């Protein structure tokens, strides 16, 4: 979280 900030 935020799931966008991790690949």
């Amino acid at each position, epitope marked *: *979280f*935020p*799931q*966008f*900030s*991790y*690949s």
Partner: single-chain antibody
Framework: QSLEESGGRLVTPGTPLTLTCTVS????????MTWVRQAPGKGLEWIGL?????ITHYANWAKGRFTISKTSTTVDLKITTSTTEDTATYFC????????????????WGPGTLVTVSAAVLTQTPSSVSSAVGGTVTINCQAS????????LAWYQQKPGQRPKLLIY???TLASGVPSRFSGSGSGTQFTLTINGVQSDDAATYYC?????????????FGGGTEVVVKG
């Protein structure tokens, strides 16, 4: 509070091209940006997004043929190679999340920039509907997989030739300045948009949009949209 986009570009097949989205009244340091395209006469389709720290995510169709980069005030979309299938209006939009919660939605939209070159699905029904003024309109959105947080389904309105406008987010939350005659419901993989007392100004196309889990699917997708006509 506002996004600005570059002009319309008439290009040859096979030639690289960069679209710009300029941001007024916030920093991309604290905001994620997403790109969405729409070919003429057709519906919204998600391309990808850039996180606050700068991590990119693409739809599966788009991976490799689009690159999203940014500075603090501007985000870009490089089209590596341009085909006829890239003929579309490309919108940028602010991605609605912060450090505490993730609303899933896109709440500020650019005016779009036309480009003429010359799994997770949302099934949205019906494809079109006609309503008497004062009538009731239901639109259904059906996921193929549960959405991020179970409920990050948003609805947008789009009048012809105008950008999309956010109405409902997290399934049932009415956006700023949206009339209460709109309301949304559902959970899991079934959601409905209702218009109770439809008005001549409600004539538009409505898209549902769902946030999924990035590590099992495209991070977002849209329904195919519903054309709503109002008979008066």
């Amino acid at each position: 509070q506002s996004l600005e986009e570059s002009g319309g570009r008439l290009v040859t097949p096979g030639t690289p091209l960069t679209l710009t989205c300029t941001v007024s009244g916030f920093s991309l340091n604290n905001n994620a940006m997403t790109w969405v395209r729409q070919a003429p006469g057709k519906g919204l389709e998600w391309i990808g997004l850039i996180s606050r720290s700068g991590i990119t995510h693409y739809a599966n169709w788009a991976k490799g043929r689009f690159t999203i980069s940014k500075t603090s005030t501007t985000v870009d979309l490089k089209i590596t190679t341009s085909t006829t299938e890239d003929t579309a209006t490309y919108f940028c939009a602010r991605v609605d999340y912060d450090d505490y919660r993730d609303w899933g939605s896109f709440n500020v939209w650019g005016p779009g920039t036309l480009v003429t070159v010359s799994a997770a699905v949302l099934t949205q029904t019906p494809s079109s509907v006609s309503s008497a003024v004062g009538g009731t309109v239901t639109i259904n959105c059906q996921a193929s997989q549960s959405l991020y947080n179970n409920k990050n389904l948003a609805w947008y309105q789009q009048k012809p030739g105008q950008r999309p406008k956010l109405l409902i987010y997290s399934a049932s939350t009415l956006a700023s300045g949206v009339p209460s005659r709109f309301s949304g419901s559902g959970s899991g993989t079934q959601f409905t948009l209702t218009i109770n007392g439809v008005q001549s100004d409600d004539a538009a196309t409505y898209y549902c949009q769902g946030e999924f889990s990035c590590s099992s699917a495209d991070c977002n997708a849209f329904g195919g949209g519903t054309e709503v006509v109002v008979k008066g």
